[PDB]
Design an enzyme around this catalytic site. Structure first.
Site, PDB file in Angstrom:
ATOM      1  N   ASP A 133       0.828  -1.196   0.000  1.00  0.00           N
ATOM      2  CA  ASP A 133       0.000   0.000   0.000  1.00  0.00           C
ATOM      3  C   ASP A 133       0.871   1.259   0.000  1.00  0.00           C
ATOM      4  O   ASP A 133       2.103   1.201  -0.043  1.00  0.00           O
ATOM      5  CB  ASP A 133      -0.954  -0.003   1.195  1.00  0.00           C
TER       6      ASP A 133
HETATM    7  O1  LIG Z   1      -2.655   3.054   1.478  1.00  0.00           O
HETATM    8  P1  LIG Z   1      -2.892   4.329   0.707  1.00  0.00           P
HETATM    9  O2  LIG Z   1      -3.730   4.033  -0.513  1.00  0.00           O
HETATM   10  O3  LIG Z   1      -1.565   4.906   0.279  1.00  0.00           O
HETATM   11  O4  LIG Z   1      -3.681   5.412   1.667  1.00  0.00           O
HETATM   12  C1  LIG Z   1      -3.732   5.156   3.041  1.00  0.00           C
HETATM   13  C2  LIG Z   1      -4.725   6.123   3.681  1.00  0.00           C
HETATM   14  C3  LIG Z   1      -5.163   5.543   5.024  1.00  0.00           C
HETATM   15  C4  LIG Z   1      -4.038   7.467   3.900  1.00  0.00           C
HETATM   16  C5  LIG Z   1      -5.924   6.316   2.749  1.00  0.00           C
HETATM   17  O5  LIG Z   1      -6.111   5.149   1.998  1.00  0.00           O
HETATM   18  C6  LIG Z   1      -7.204   6.613   3.530  1.00  0.00           C
HETATM   19  O6  LIG Z   1      -8.123   5.872   3.446  1.00  0.00           O
HETATM   20  N1  LIG Z   1      -7.318   7.797   4.363  1.00  0.00           N
HETATM   21  C7  LIG Z   1      -8.552   8.040   5.086  1.00  0.00           C
HETATM   22  C8  LIG Z   1      -8.375   9.194   6.069  1.00  0.00           C
HETATM   23  C9  LIG Z   1      -7.615   8.950   7.370  1.00  0.00           C
HETATM   24  O7  LIG Z   1      -6.895   8.017   7.476  1.00  0.00           O
HETATM   25  N2  LIG Z   1      -7.787   9.869   8.480  1.00  0.00           N
HETATM   26  C10 LIG Z   1      -7.077   9.654   9.726  1.00  0.00           C
HETATM   27  C11 LIG Z   1      -5.784  10.461   9.766  1.00  0.00           C
HETATM   28  S1  LIG Z   1      -4.452   9.411  10.414  1.00  0.00           S
HETATM   29  C12 LIG Z   1      -4.134   9.861  12.143  1.00  0.00           C
HETATM   30  O8  LIG Z   1      -4.996  10.348  12.793  1.00  0.00           O
HETATM   31  C13 LIG Z   1      -2.760   9.608  12.760  1.00  0.00           C
HETATM   32  C14 LIG Z   1      -2.753   9.823  14.270  1.00  0.00           C
HETATM   33  C15 LIG Z   1      -1.347  10.086  14.803  1.00  0.00           C
HETATM   34  C16 LIG Z   1      -1.045  11.576  14.936  1.00  0.00           C
HETATM   35  C17 LIG Z   1       0.232  11.973  14.199  1.00  0.00           C
HETATM   36  C18 LIG Z   1       1.060  12.991  14.977  1.00  0.00           C
HETATM   37  C19 LIG Z   1       2.389  12.411  15.456  1.00  0.00           C
HETATM   38  C20 LIG Z   1       2.905  13.120  16.705  1.00  0.00           C
HETATM   39  C21 LIG Z   1       4.216  13.866  16.462  1.00  0.00           C
HETATM   40  C22 LIG Z   1       5.439  12.970  16.641  1.00  0.00           C
HETATM   41  C23 LIG Z   1       6.716  13.775  16.873  1.00  0.00           C
END
Ligand SMILES: *OP(=O)(O)OCC(C)(C)[C@@H](O)C(=O)NCCC(=O)NCCSC(=O)CCCCCCCCCCC
Ligand SMILES: CCCCCCCCCCCCCCCCCC(=O)OC[C@H](COP(=O)([O-])OCC(O)COP(=O)([O-])OC[C@@H](COC(=O)CCCCCCCCCCCCCCCCC)OC(=O)CCCCCCCCCCCCCCCCC)OC(=O)CCCCCCCCCCCCCCCCC
Ligand SMILES: CCCCCCCCCCCCCCCCCC(=O)OC[C@H](COP(=O)([O-])OCC(O)COP(=O)([O-])OC[C@@H](COC(=O)CCCCCCCCCCCCCCCCC)OC(=O)CCCCCCCCCCCCCCCCC)OC(=O)CCCCCCCCCCCCCCCCC
Ligand SMILES: CCCCCCCCCCCCCCCCC[C@@H](O)O[C@H](CO[C@H](O)CCCCCCCCCCCCCCC)COP(=O)(O)OCC[N+](C)(C)C
Ligand SMILES: CCCCCCCC/C=C\CCCCCCCC(=O)OC[C@H](COP(=O)(O)OCCN)OC(=O)CCCCCCC/C=C\CCCCCCCC
Ligand SMILES: CCCCCCCC/C=C\CCCCCCCC(=O)O[C@H](COC(=O)CCCCCCC/C=C/CCCCCCCC)COP(=O)(O)OCCN
Lengths: 459, 175, 80, 124, 110, 178, 62, 104, 128, 67, 55, 88
Positions: free
Chosen positions: L43
């Site tokens: 992916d």
């Molecule tokens: O596999 P792909 O086709 O490349 O895509 C994957 C993906 C999941 C992005 C896509 O397919 C999809 O469906 N996106 C939907 C939206 C989504 O995922 N929304 C959630 C956002 S992710 C999140 O919340 C991560 C939480 C962690 C916070 C990060 C901050 C880190 C702290 C700082 C560290 C120093």
């Protein structure tokens, strides 16, 4: 004194009787010979001046000015022959005639014994400069700038005449020696105040004093290379020479009337130095730095101390040479890119290394790097002002901090960084331009070993 | 040396201590001094003696110019330009001579401070006193004249000082 | 020059802290797919390293031996 | 530190002020004090070009140490006795200064105690 | 200070050159055995800088501290000087630990 | 830096960029390798927790809170590669980069040295001169009448052509010119 | 060629400097001023032959 | 100019400008050799608070330490010859008040 | 949930914390496409002259000429005397002069009064 | 000297650098030990700090609170 | 200082991650002195050089 | 002196070496022209980690807009060669 004046006059029929392809060579050679002859005036006395005759005399203040004025003409001829190539023979000879007439007028102005003759030549210098600026300038503003050059000076110089002919009607003479020996104090009255103003503002305009300086960023920018060179190197120093000469009859009123001009100058140093920091035009930056430097000489002459006078003389000579070199360096870039915008051409050190070295030396000398004579004059003026008032050290030093700022910035913007990609017509520097910078800078460093030659009559 | 006068540029008898060693180790300073004398000093003095022999073959002299005493500004009339010019030139010459006298005294003070080392505050009181007296006299004469100075301005300053002293003396005599 | 890469099958996380990371991740239901890529940092001459105090005492043994032999010689020589 | 804590946190009037000290005459409690003796003459100190701070009551040992430095120059490890003697003399000077400090401190804590006792004896 | 500061900087430059112009200590791993001469030089320099007895810095820094301790001194200045003396060893430990101890953290092409 | 930019970044690109940035800053925080691997697996699990969210508003909100958390928890001194825009060797070798047209101003004595190089340079100059009109015509014919919507350039489509606007891309000075 | 560098960069400059100092610089007064040498008790003067008396009978607290 | 993308293929990479695009009125102040307005990890008005508080606390502590100095439990240093009166300036024609040092 | 970051003049708001990039409309996409189209047309116009083999000299940028002209020559024609302009000009051009004049006059009068009564310790003040 | 990059192996080392580093470390430690054994007073002091409480009131000239 | 520095450096080996405190942010960003003194005075000076002095 | 003149074969060897050390990739099925999505069933988040591994391998950072497009080891090798001016 005629041994210098007459060859300068003979330069004219020589130029007008020369071949169509031999004017520059002969003019340069004979102007350099005249400079060599004029070098003999540096043998000054320690008590009284060199009185050649009833009409002409030479002191320790006017000898370096004479030498610089005679030395500038070959440099002007060398710098002018590049952009005047397509010009016709008659107009080339007319331009050389204008330069020779300007040099002759300056030579007679710096050596006149009597004040009315000094004023006549000091005003006659306007015509060749105006003709050069308004005829061989490049842009449409050259006309308007010319007017700014013409009416700023005259509006200040016309009352001066009214003062001078008045003084001769009361003291009986305008000879400088008689005026010095028969000097009398100035009473504190409105009439004496206005006579003080009339005898001073003509030289304040030519400095230019902050507030009356608007003509300079126009005239210097729109003039050709030789016009700007003669404006910065010599024409600005006429006000200083005349003010140093005429401050004899103004005491003790100079104690009271100098306060507005002193305040204007000490604040204009900061104003012009800050203006230099934000300037999209390189030639305008050099022009504003000229005013920033001349405000110091104004202060030095106003405070009326021997150390201040020596500093003013040294700073005048040093600034003349430095500003001439900086204008030449800017013109070299302009003749390549045909634009005065500073950020248009960048990273020129990679393409023109020796010209970058010339730029570095000029910038270092501009910011008064010791033991250059710029630093000597600046430090003498600073010490004299500190004796005048301690608080002055707050301003002067601040100006120094700004002076090194816009200089190196000017060096960084044009020489360092990366070259602009679309420009591809940057040819290697010619021998003529390199020789021009070498002849600008070598006397500047040579004068360090013998500072007493440019320290004036107060040494 | 005989090049300068020892009365105008005096110095103490130059007491120095004789070397008195205690350890048996060799002195590197002595060895290096001998090397410098054998390698550097001897060629230099040979070249200088050759130059002196060359100079002695051509002996010519130069003279110190003597200037007569002309009447001062006090004896000149109001608008008599010639005596005024001569007196002004004489005054300028005297001013330069006074400047050089102050310079000589300052040189004495500098040499004192460097020579006396850590005892300069005590062993150079005479030089400091001489410099103070000379500086006071020079300040009384030429200070505050400013640029465009002349003999007339100095005379006016002296007259004002004399008036002040006369008034002070009269005030003191009234007690 | 004229050298080729070592065999990639030798990079095993065995005996390294990557085992510790793998076990604590398996205790969470996750896996480390890049664990082998870093095994080279723990395999060869980098397997064992000295501590801070051992680093400070880099040549203490030889210097101490020289010091003690010199002192023992000088102490008995001073008894002339 | 202890004296700093006692002076700043306790009563300041019970301990000396280093700037204004000593506040008592040198013969206030002593029956007879002999003047401190200086060995090196002023001319010797001037000729040796000692630093003004170095020109103290221990100057003779310093002069000896400098002379032994200059005499045995290549052997820079020879003046152990002279350096030790100079250091011991400076140590004695420092302990004399500490003795003066303690004497002044206890004089101050005795004087005010006597005055307060005299005042309490005059309550009625 | 001139001696050991200049040689500490040369050791840092040697590490930077050997790590392909890399200056971050986070990508410098175990250089204790990979660079024995540079390692021993930096260890000696850090010891001298921190005032290890009878090294070069001992004859000046320790006397400076003892002179500040026995002078009519601003108390805050003395306290800050002592805290700075501790922080010197603190950052020397930081440099040594993050540059020479642990496991390599630089690109594998040695 | 070679790819032409788009008008906007889609949600997937934004999430991928956030993931890469968070992993880089986590590596900056976790100096040691095994600790970084552990917490990178934790972060990957956290990202995969919402891998299949179909509510676009919810996904945008989640990305917004993730960005806020990253900005609060970012490393004040993140690791930067030496030649990266923030590195210690970003523009170190730009002073050594000289444009090739300067070679046209060399004195004939200088061109006497390196004769084969200047012969090949003349061949390259002739090749550039002979193919400019075809490239201009291709750009004119392929471009929509209104104008180019993006900065992407078309490749050569015939046999004896070169891709339009190729000279300055191909004749870059170097990465290590000296 | 064995030690040509040591005579063109050291010997010639020191010759020139020594000549300039000895025969030109010291021709003027106060150009080269030296710190007074330290004199200690028991020293012997090389100019007058004087002997500086000893330092007044140490208390000898040993 | 620092906030602009450094991975974009700018016509002027050092200035980070494209040919023909409008130029800011204050470009020469933002040339990135100069004033920078890039976002910071800690917000403004918090860095200012921390810096001003640290500076003020340092100044106040220095003043307090001046009010409460640190010294040793010793008396004044004693100098033999009238506190070196002749060495400390001179004036040998005054004979100042004898300072007397006694053994303790 | 976390301490919020607030922007300032010298510390601007980051792109990732800007809500404008998280509320998109079809008109927003159209505006972004139009901006890209303008940028791409300018890029093509620049690259056509940049890669031209016949071209020798400097490519003239009308934006740079406009910038310089606006900064230098277009200011006075667009100037109008207003209370704000008049007040700012009067202050920034007049206040510093009188402030420095007052400061220097006060200092010099104090010095001259000290000189008149003869208490300044002007010893060794030979040079001025 | 000519050593090659190793790509995930310990770098090649020469005998001279290892022996030089070990020798210089041993030299530094020997110098420290030798100076400590000869100049211990530079670290532990040479003279003892007297206790002011141990000084009698007769040594400091103190009257018995009745005069 | 040696001991505390070594202890806090060995602390980094643990498999624990936490966000930095304000003291560490102050120490790492050089007390916010370059972040403030290189931006506020420079901006004010360069703005006044053009808005008032020049224009 | 400095780093050796790395070649195309070296870049390909290093890229395949790093990929073969990825647990999600079977070394046998892996090839130079193996697409990351179609052939290996990965992916986008996996592709980001592959790009980061490439960056850590070769010590330089690939911009995201250029990183998203590299879909097989051959594209990565070509991009690195264009970065480092490698012609053989
Ligand atoms: O596999 P792909 O086709 O490349 O895509 C994957 C993906 C999941 C992005 C896509 O397919 C999809 O469906 N996106 C939907 C939206 C989504 O995922 N929304 C959630 C956002 S992710 C999140 O919340 C991560 C939480 C962690 C916070 C990060 C901050 C880190 C702290 C700082 C560290 C120093
Ligand atoms: C103190 C040093 C002792 C020197 C011994 C004597 C040397 C005499 C030199 C006289 C001056 C040279 C003439 C100036 C123009 C240069 C000509 C040129 O084009 O060079 C090409 C030439 C060919 O090389 P290239 O490969 O083709 O380079 C092409 C590229 O352009 C590549 O170019 P680049 O990158 O190589 O740059 C060129 C180079 C050279 O360019 C320069 O800028 C040199 C000019 C000096 C600065 C000028 C402006 C600053 C104001 C100070 C003015 C000082 C005047 C002193 C009197 C001068 C007498 C003439 O730039 C520099 O090296 C840096 C300059 C910054 C110097 C800062 C130090 C200032 C104070 C130092 C003390 C000054 C007083 C000494 C006494 C003090 C008490 C004892 O290069 C040289 O040979 C080097 C030039 C000489 C170096 C001079 C550096 C120090 C000199 C300071 C003043 C001299 C004092 C002498 C008294 C004895 C002491
Ligand atoms: C001999 C008798 C004396 C005995 C004394 C008693 C025994 C010792 C006492 C203990 C003293 C502290 C010792 C612990 C060291 C701290 C380490 C630590 O973990 O701290 C945790 C934490 C930082 O840890 P972290 O953020 O989680 O770590 C992130 C990662 O680890 C990032 O990882 P990394 O790899 O980047 O590493 C970061 C770095 C650590 O990152 C840091 O930068 C934080 C450490 C700060 C060090 C500050 C120490 C001295 C500060 C002096 C400041 C003077 C006043 C300034 C106050 C200005 C107020 C605005 O780690 C290190 O490199 C090693 C740390 C240094 C250890 C060696 C320190 C020894 C010298 C200090 C002790 C003094 C001993 C000699 C004294 C002799 C005098 C007679 O900092 C703190 O919370 C405490 C800091 C201590 C002072 C702050 C005071 C509170 C601030 C606000 C107060 C309220 C103000 C209200 C407004 C008022 C306006 C007027
Ligand atoms: C942009 C730069 C251009 C150049 C600027 C040149 C500056 C020219 C200013 C001249 C300086 C001094 C001139 C007159 C001396 C004192 C002026 C006055 O302020 O002092 C008082 C003067 O008193 C009153 O103020 C009278 C003057 C009031 C009327 C004058 C109008 C001033 C307004 C400012 C005009 C702007 C000047 C520039 C015009 C373009 C002193 O009180 P008093 O003891 O009784 O008079 C002593 C003088 N005596 C001995 C001759 C009698
Ligand atoms: C007497 C005067 C005292 C000083 C008053 C304030 C002076 C202000 C000068 C204004 C100059 C404006 C033009 C400067 C040119 C612009 C410029 O240089 O850009 C700023 C440039 C870029 O920032 P960087 O962090 O280096 O890089 C970021 C990008 N990666 O940084 C700088 O150069 C800023 C320097 C300005 C310093 C201002 C602060 C100085 C004030 C100190 C006062 C304290 C005095 C203490 C006295 C000690 C006791 C004796
Ligand atoms: C670019 C702008 C430069 C401005 C230059 C103009 C400023 C010059 C200052 C005024 C010049 C007039 C003085 C003329 C010569 C003076 C000679 C003299 O001493 O005559 C006075 C007379 O003085 C005057 O009459 C002059 C009065 C002014 C008349 C013209 C007014 C012009 C404006 C004056 C004020 C402005 C000055 C500053 C200008 C600021 C420019 C920015 C005494 O004569 P008596 O009658 O014999 O008196 C003694 C016996 N009872």
């Amino acid at each position: 004194m005629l041994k210098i004046i007459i060859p300068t006059t003979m330069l004219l029929p020589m130029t007008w009787m020369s071949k169509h392809n031999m004017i520059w060579i002969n003019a340069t050679v004979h102007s350099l010979l005249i400079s060599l002859i004029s070098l003999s005036l540096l043998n000054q006395l320690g008590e009284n001046s060199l009185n050649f005759s009833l009409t002409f005399f030479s002191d320790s203040l006017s000898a370096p000015l004479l030498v610089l004025t005679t030395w500038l003409l070959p440099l002007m001829l060398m710098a002018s022959q590049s952009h005047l190539s397509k010009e016709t023979t008659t107009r080339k000879k007319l331009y050389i005639t204008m330069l020779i007439l300007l040099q002759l007028f300056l030579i007679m102005t710096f050596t006149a014994t009597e004040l009315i003759l000094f004023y006549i030549l000091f005003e006659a210098t306007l015509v060749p400069t105006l003709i050069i600026i308004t005829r061989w300038g490049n842009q449409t503003e050259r006309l308007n700038a010319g007017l700014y050059f013409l009416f700023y000076t005259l509006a200040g110089s016309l009352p001066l005449l009214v003062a001078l002919v008045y003084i001769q009607n009361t003291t009986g003479s305008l000879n400088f020696l008689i005026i010095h020996y028969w000097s009398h104090p100035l009473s504190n009255s409105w009439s004496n105040i206005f006579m003080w103003l009339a005898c001073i503002m003509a030289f304040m305009v030519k400095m230019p004093l902050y507030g009356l300086h608007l003509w300079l960023p126009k005239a210097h920018v729109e003039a050709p290379i030789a016009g700007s060179m003669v404006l910065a190197a010599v024409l600005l120093k006429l006000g200083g020479y005349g003010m140093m000469r005429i401050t004899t009859i103004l005491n003790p009123l100079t104690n009271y009337m100098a306060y507005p001009f002193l305040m204007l100058s000490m604040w204009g140093m900061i104003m012009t130095s800050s203006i230099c920091l934000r300037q999209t035009d390189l030639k305008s930056l050099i022009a504003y730095s000229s005013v920033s430097h001349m405000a110091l000489v104004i202060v030095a002459i106003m405070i009326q101390t021997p150390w201040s006078f020596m500093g003013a003389t040294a700073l005048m000579i040093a600034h003349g040479l430095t500003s001439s070199m900086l204008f030449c360096l800017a013109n070299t870039n302009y003749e390549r890119v045909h634009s005065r915008t500073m950020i248009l051409a960048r990273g020129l050190q990679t393409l023109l290394p020796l010209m970058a070295t010339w730029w570095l030396v000029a910038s270092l000398t501009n910011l008064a790097l010791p033991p250059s004579i710029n630093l000597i004059g600046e430090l003498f003026i600073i010490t004299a002002s500190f004796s005048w008032s301690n608080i002055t050290i707050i301003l002067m030093g601040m100006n120094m901090m700004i002076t090194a700022l816009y200089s190196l910035y000017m060096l960084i913007t044009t020489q360092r960084g990366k070259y602009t990609h679309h420009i591809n017509n940057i040819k290697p520097s010619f021998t003529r331009e390199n020789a021009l910078m070498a002849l600008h800078i070598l006397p500047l460093l040579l004068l360090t070993l013998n500072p007493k030659m440019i320290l004036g009559p107060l040494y | 040396p005989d090049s300068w006068d020892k009365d105008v540029y005096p110095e103490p008898p130059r007491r120095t201590p004789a070397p008195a060693p205690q350890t048996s180790l060799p002195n590197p300073v002595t060895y290096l001094t001998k090397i410098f004398d054998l390698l550097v000093d001897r060629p230099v003095t040979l070249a200088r003696e050759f130059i002196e022999q060359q100079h002695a073959k051509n002996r010519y002299y130069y003279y110190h110019r003597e200037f007569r005493r002309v009447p001062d500004i006090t004896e000149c009339e109001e608008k008599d330009i010639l005596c005024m010019f001569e007196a002004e030139m004489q005054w300028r010459r005297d001013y330069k001579v006074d400047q050089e006298i102050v310079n000589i005294i300052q040189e004495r003070l500098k040499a004192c401070q460097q020579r006396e080392g850590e005892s300069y505050r005590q062993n150079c009181a005479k030089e400091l006193e001489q410099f103070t007296q000379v500086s006071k006299a020079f300040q009384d004469r030429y200070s505050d004249l400013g640029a465009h100075y002349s003999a007339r301005k100095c005379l006016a300053k002296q007259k004002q000082r004399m008036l002040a002293e006369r008034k002070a003396a009269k005030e003191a005599a009234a007690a | 020059s004229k050298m080729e890469l070592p065999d990639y099958k030798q990079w095993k996380i065995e005996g390294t802290p990557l085992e510790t990371v793998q076990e604590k991740l398996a205790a969470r239901g996750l896996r480390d797919p890049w664990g082998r890529n870093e095994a080279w940092r723990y395999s060869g001459g980098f397997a064992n390293n000295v501590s801070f105090v051992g680093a400070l005492l880099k040549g203490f043994k030889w210097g101490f031996a020289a010091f003690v032999v010199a002192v023992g010689a000088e102490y008995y020589l001073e008894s002339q | 530190g202890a004296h700093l804590a006692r002076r700043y946190l306790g009563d300041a009037s019970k301990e000396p002020d280093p700037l204004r000290m000593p506040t008592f005459p040198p013969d206030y409690g002593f029956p007879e004090r002999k003047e401190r003796e200086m060995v090196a003459t002023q001319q010797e100190m001037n000729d040796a070009q000692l630093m003004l701070q170095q020109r103290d009551y221990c100057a003779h040992y310093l002069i000896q140490l400098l002379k032994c430095k200059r005499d045995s120059f290549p052997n820079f490890l020879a003046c152990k006795h002279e350096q030790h003697d100079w250091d011991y003399c400076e140590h004695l000077d420092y302990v004399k200064r500490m003795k003066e400090f303690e004497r002044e401190r206890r004089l101050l804590q005795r004087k005010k105690r006597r005055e307060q006792r005299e005042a309490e004896m005059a309550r009625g | 200070h001139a001696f050991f500061k200049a040689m500490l900087f040369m050791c840092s430059g040697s590490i930077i050159h050997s790590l392909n112009d890399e200056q971050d200590i986070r990508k410098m791993g175990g250089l204790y055995k990979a660079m024995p001469f540079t390692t021993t030089a930096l260890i000696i320099g850090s010891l001298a800088l921190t005032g290890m007895p009878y090294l070069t810095g001992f004859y000046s820094k320790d006397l400076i501290i003892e002179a500040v301790n026995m002078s009519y001194t601003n108390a805050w200045a003395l306290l800050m000087t002592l805290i700075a003396t501790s922080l010197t060893a603190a950052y020397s430990t930081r440099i040594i630990f993050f540059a020479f101890l642990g496991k390599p953290r630089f690109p594998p092409l040695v | 830096a070679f790819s032409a930019p788009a008008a906007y970044l889609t949600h997937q690109q934004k999430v991928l960029r956030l993931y890469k940035r968070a992993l880089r800053h986590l590596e900056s925080w976790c100096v040691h390798r095994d600790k970084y691997r552990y917490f990178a697996c934790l972060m990957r699990a956290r990202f995969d927790e919402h891998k299949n969210e179909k509510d676009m508003v919810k996904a945008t909100q989640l990305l917004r809170q993730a960005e806020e958390e990253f900005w609060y928890g970012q490393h004040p001194q993140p690791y930067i590669f030496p030649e990266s825009p923030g590195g210690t060797s970003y523009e170190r070798y730009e002073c050594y980069k000289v444009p090739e047209w300067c070679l046209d101003d060399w004195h004939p004595s200088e061109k006497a040295m390196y004769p084969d190089y200047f012969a090949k340079r003349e061949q390259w100059k002739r090749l550039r001169r002979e193919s400019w009109e075809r490239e201009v015509k291709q750009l004119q014919e392929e471009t929509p009448p209104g104008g180019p919507r993006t900065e992407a350039l078309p490749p050569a489509r015939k046999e004896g052509d070169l891709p339009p606007l190729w000279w300055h891309i191909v004749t870059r000075p170097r990465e290590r010119p000296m | 060629r064995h030690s040509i560098f040591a005579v063109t960069h050291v010997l010639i400059p020191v010759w020139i400097i020594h000549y300039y100092l000895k025969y030109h610089v010291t021709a003027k007064p106060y150009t080269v001023v030296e710190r007074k040498p330290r004199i200690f008790p028991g020293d012997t003067i090389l100019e007058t032959g004087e002997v500086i008396p000893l330092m007044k009978e140490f208390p000898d607290q040993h | 100019q620092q906030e602009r993308d450094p991975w974009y293929d700018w016509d002027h990479p050092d200035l980070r400008l494209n040919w023909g695009e409008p130029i800011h009125w204050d470009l020469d102040m933002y040339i990135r050799n100069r004033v920078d307005t890039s976002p910071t990890p800690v917000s403004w008005n918090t860095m200012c608070k921390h810096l001003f508080g640290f500076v003020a606390f340092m100044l106040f502590m220095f003043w307090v330490g001046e009010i409460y100095p640190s010294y040793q439990p010793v008396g004044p240093k004693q100098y033999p010859y009238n506190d070196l009166y002749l060495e400390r300036g001179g004036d040998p024609t005054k004979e100042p008040e004898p300072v007397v040092h006694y053994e303790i | 949930s976390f301490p919020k970051y607030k922007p300032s003049r010298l510390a601007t708001l980051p792109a990732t914390l800007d809500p404008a990039e998280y509320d998109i409309s079809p008109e927003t996409r159209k505006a972004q496409a139009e901006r890209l189209a303008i940028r791409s047309r300018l890029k093509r116009e620049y690259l056509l002259q940049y890669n031209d083999p016949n071209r020798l000299g400097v490519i003239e940028d009308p934006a740079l000429i406009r910038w310089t002209y606006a900064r230098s020559a277009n200011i006075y024609p667009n100037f109008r005397p207003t209370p704000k302009t008049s007040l700012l000009g009067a202050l920034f051009g007049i206040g510093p002069l009188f402030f420095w004049y007052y400061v220097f006059k006060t200092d010099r009068d104090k010095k001259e009064k000290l000189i008149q009564e003869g208490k300044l310790d002007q010893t060794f003040n030979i040079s001025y | 000297v000519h050593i090659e990059p190793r790509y995930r192996q310990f770098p090649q080392l020469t005998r001279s650098q290892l022996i030089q580093a070990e020798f210089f470390s041993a030299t530094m430690w020997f110098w420290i030990l030798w100076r400590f054994w000869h100049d211990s007073d530079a670290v532990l002091g040479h003279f003892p700090y007297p206790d002011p409480s141990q000084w009698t009131d007769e040594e400091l000239g103190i009257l018995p609170d009745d005069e | 200082g040696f001991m505390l520095a070594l202890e806090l450096n060995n602390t980094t080996y643990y498999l624990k991650f936490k966000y930095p405190s304000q003291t560490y942010k102050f120490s790492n960003m050089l007390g916010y002195y370059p972040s403030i003194m290189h931006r506020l005075p420079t901006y004010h000076n360069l703005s006044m050089s053009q808005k008032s002095a020049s224009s | 002196s400095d780093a050796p003149p790395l070649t195309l074969e070296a870049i390909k060897d290093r890229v395949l070496y790093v990929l073969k050390l990825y647990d999600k990739i079977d070394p046998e099925k892996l090839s130079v022209n193996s697409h990351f999505m179609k052939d290996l069933g990965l992916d986008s988040l996996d592709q980001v980690e592959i790009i980061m591994a490439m960056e850590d391998e070769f010590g330089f950072e690939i911009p995201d807009i250029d990183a998203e497009k590299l879909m097989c080891p051959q594209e990565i090798v070509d991009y690195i060669a264009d970065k480092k001016d490698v012609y053989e």
